[PDB]
């Protein structure tokens, strides 16, 4: 009998939350931005093509300097490229070839990787010897790691396929805080510009907002009908965008706790693998399963352009800190730097 | 280019040479994906996923065991698009045991793996384990408990043939792939020999398809 009462209380709380969200929504973002000048057309060209991978590329991450980028692939390799000159700087062979995520430290000293091995391995790039050594192998997750992000040189936040995200202390190798609440596998992670509160998207068609210190869920966003694969904060930290298998991108605001706009096209029936914003945030670059990337005017839900040129699925794309370039990875073992 | 630019280019070229060498070395190495519901002893041992490397007659084998990954398969099964073959282990003694029937759950998993959109052309090696126990417990219990429409002799050979036929009859698109079935014995590494034969046949088919004379 108590279970029924608890379920009724939970349903009442959910109804109250829905009523509050409905009340807070008066004018749509499309209504407000109807009276702005649309972007005419975006025509980016492949400035560089980074070759050398012999397997599907599952992850990439730009550096803070916006010149060096890290890649991960099934060939058990993790390459740091010089994008300006197309020169390989390091070629780190991973102990596990099943890598699904890669990260670049903001300071540039370390890179991280993870995958089916249930380990986030930190690699020290700047050592007295000329090789990159494994700083340590972080363990504790039960499911595959989907996204690892550096907060600083000592703290790394990871998303796993055991429905829990974790915050680590690299010096001690211990989980400082474990985040719980997701029913499904967590497939995405994005840190706020202040590195203060981050958001994760899971396969329960929900996105949850966390705090690194307190380790509890501030907000829950539920708009999607399928599995969220990628997530990205707005540059101001007050909004984030999600990509899901139902061929729709959605914009959520943290303060209003609601979905503002949805990005969808009739000709698009494939899923979304990676989403990123421009430096200003008006362009939403989303990768897709149909071998190409799309540029969406984030304020008008209009397709500004298409980044075609990949012969297989686009798995990871990133936009540099200075906003000059966009680098898209694909399963055809080819990176391409756009403008 | 400057002096450091030239030296960086030379370093990148050395990295490219090493990458090409590693790719050539890893292209001839056979990748196997081991699944079950089941029986892994003597086949995988002789958190995370388990990597097993062994060599049989000038071929290097990698077998991946993903049984410890307790998550949704649809988000990590595409990592095994290029595996040479899928080794699937089904126990024959689970027809009368419940974890739905154990054998029926095994058949459902086999159907999902065989008809997955990533393995439309990936051969499956079906190892039917515990044949000694199945022969021991088949006289005292008929297969009608698992398959009510058996209508056949309750002997070891007929029962095994029926199980095998039910297993390859779940293989739609039965033109681009052959399912290899073997009842696991423990003499003279016959399981390894069967895996070798299946893998070399698959290698021949792949080479012929690549060369454009298929």
């Amino acid at each position: 009998s108590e279970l029924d009462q608890l379920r009724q209380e939970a349903e009442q709380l959910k109804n109250q939350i829905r009523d509050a969200r409905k009340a807070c929504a008066d004018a749509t973002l499309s209504q407000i931005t109807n009276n702005i000048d649309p972007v005419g057309r975006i025509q980016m060209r492949t400035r560089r093509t980074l070759r050398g991978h012999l397997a599907k590329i599952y992850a990439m991450h730009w550096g803070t300097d916006s010149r060096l980028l890290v890649s991960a692939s099934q060939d058990g390799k993790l390459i740091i490229w010089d994008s300006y000159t197309t020169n390989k700087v390091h070629a780190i062979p991973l102990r596990s070839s099943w890598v699904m995520t890669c990260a670049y430290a903001p300071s540039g000293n370390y890179v991280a990787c993870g995958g089916l091995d249930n380990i986030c391995s930190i690699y020290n790039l700047k050592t007295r010897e000329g090789n990159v050594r494994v700083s340590r192998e972080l363990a504790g997750h039960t499911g595959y790691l989907s996204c690892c992000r550096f907060l600083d040189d000592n703290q790394i936040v990871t998303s796993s396929g055991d429905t829990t995200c974790a915050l680590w202390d690299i010096e001690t190798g211990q989980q400082t805080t474990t985040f719980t609440g997701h029913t499904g596998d967590v497939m995405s992670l994005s840190l706020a510009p202040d590195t203060r509160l981050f958001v994760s998207g899971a396969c329960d068609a929900s996105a949850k907002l966390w705090d690194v210190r307190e380790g509890m869920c501030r907000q829950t966003f539920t708009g999607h009908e399928s599995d969220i694969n990628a997530i990205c904060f707005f540059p101001n930290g007050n909004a984030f965008a999600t990509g899901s298998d139902d061929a729709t991108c959605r914009l959520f605001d943290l303060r209003a706790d609601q979905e503002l706009m949805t990005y969808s096209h009739d000709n698009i029936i494939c899923g979304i693998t990676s989403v990123s914003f421009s430096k200003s945030g008006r362009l939403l670059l989303a990768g897709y399963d149909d071998f190409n990337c799309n540029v969406w005017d984030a304020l008008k839900a209009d397709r500004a352009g298409v980044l075609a040129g990949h012969d297989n699925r686009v798995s990871c794309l990133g936009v540099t800190d200075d906003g000059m370039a966009v680098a898209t990875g694909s399963w055809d073992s080819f990176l391409k730097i756009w403008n | 280019l400057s002096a450091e630019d030239k030296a960086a280019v030379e370093r990148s070229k050395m990295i490219d040479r090493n990458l090409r060498e590693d790719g050539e070395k890893a292209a001839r190495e056979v990748k196997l994906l081991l699944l079950g519901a089941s029986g892994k002893n003597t086949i995988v041992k002789q958190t995370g996923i388990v990597e097993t490397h062994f060599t049989f007659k000038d071929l290097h084998f990698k077998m991946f065991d993903v049984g410890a990954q307790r998550s949704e398969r649809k988000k990590w099964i595409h990592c095994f698009e290029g595996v040479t073959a899928i080794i699937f282990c089904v126990a024959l003694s689970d027809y009368d045991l419940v974890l739905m029937n154990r054998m029926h759950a095994s058949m459902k998993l086999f159907d999902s793996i065989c008809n997955n959109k990533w393995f439309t052309d990936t051969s499956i090696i079906l190892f039917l384990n515990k044949k000694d126990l199945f022969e021991e417990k088949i006289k005292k219990s008929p297969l009608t408990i698992c398959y009510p429409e058996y209508a056949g002799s309750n002997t070891y050979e007929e029962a095994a043939a029926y199980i095998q036929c039910q297993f390859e009859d779940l293989n739609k698109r039965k033109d681009t792939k052959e399912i290899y079935t073997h009842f696991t014995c423990s003499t003279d590494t016959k399981n390894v020999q069967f895996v070798f034969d299946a893998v070399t046949d698959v290698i021949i088919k792949n080479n012929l398809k690549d060369c454009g004379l298929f």
Partner: single-chain antibody
Framework: VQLVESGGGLVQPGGSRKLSCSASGFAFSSFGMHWVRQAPEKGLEWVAYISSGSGTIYYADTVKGRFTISRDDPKNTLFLQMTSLRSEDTAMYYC??????????????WGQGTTLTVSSSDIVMTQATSSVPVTPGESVSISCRSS???????????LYWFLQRPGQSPQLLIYRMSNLASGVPDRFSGSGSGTAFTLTISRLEAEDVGVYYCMQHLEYPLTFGAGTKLEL
């Protein structure tokens, strides 16, 4: 990380000797290596250079055709074969580690150095000052000049600042301008542009006493400047 050399000794003029350097503590296969020689009372001079993989070699014009440089990666050793030794080849020979990628720190480590005694176009680096007197707790600026501008089209200026402590091998302080080498205290700074460079020490201590040398890596004669000696 350490480099030790061997050989040296008294060589009759016109003879030949093979200097060898042993590398320990680092991935010797991945670093290009240099030979920098110092006269018994003069500045540093660059002799030869062998790259990673033994795919790119250079010699100084004063030792070209008479010296041979080769490395043995499995043994972590390096050699410098000399033919037709002259009285001008007497010097203390140093082996220098140098790795070249983006953001690298070339000339980071220097060997102890072995002495060789023999019985009896190119960018010029100018360090006009010498025997500059210093007092502890005071700031000192050291100048350096180049015949050709060291600012490449990519924005990288190639000026290497070194520190020759009395009785010790040179230590890298600044590799590219305003790039402080690892392990160097954060009181050293580099500034300048084109053909003019300065090195500023915030508060010089007893360990900052020595001879400071320049380098250009723009081309492949590697030229130094007669160092400026700081004395208490």
């Amino acid at each position: 990380v350490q480099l030790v050399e061997s050989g040296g000794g008294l060589v009759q003029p016109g003879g030949s000797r093979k200097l060898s350097c042993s590398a320990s503590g680092f991935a010797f296969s991945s670093f290009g290596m240099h030979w920098v020689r110092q006269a018994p009372e003069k500045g540093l001079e660059w002799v030869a250079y062998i790259s990673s993989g033994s795919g790119t070699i250079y010699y100084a014009d004063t030792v070209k055709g008479r010296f041979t440089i080769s490395r043995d990666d499995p043994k972590n050793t390096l050699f410098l074969q000399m033919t037709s030794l002259r009285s001008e080849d007497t010097a203390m020979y140093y082996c220098v580690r140098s790795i070249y990628y983006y953001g690298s720190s070339p000339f980071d480590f220097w060997g102890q150095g072995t002495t060789l005694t023999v019985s009896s176009s190119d960018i010029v680096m100018t360090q006009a000052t010498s025997s500059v007197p210093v007092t502890p707790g005071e700031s000192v600026s050291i100048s350096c000049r180049s015949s050709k501008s060291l600012l490449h089209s990519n924005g990288n200026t190639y000026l290497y600042w070194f520190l020759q402590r009395p009785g010790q091998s040179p230590q890298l302080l600044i590799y590219r301008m305003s790039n402080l080498a690892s392990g160097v205290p954060d009181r050293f700074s580099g500034s300048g542009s084109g053909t003019a460079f300065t090195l500023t020490i915030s508060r010089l201590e007893a360990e900052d006493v020595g001879v400071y040398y320049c380098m250009q890596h723009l081309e492949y004669p590697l030229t130094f400047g007669a160092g400026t000696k700081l004395e208490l």
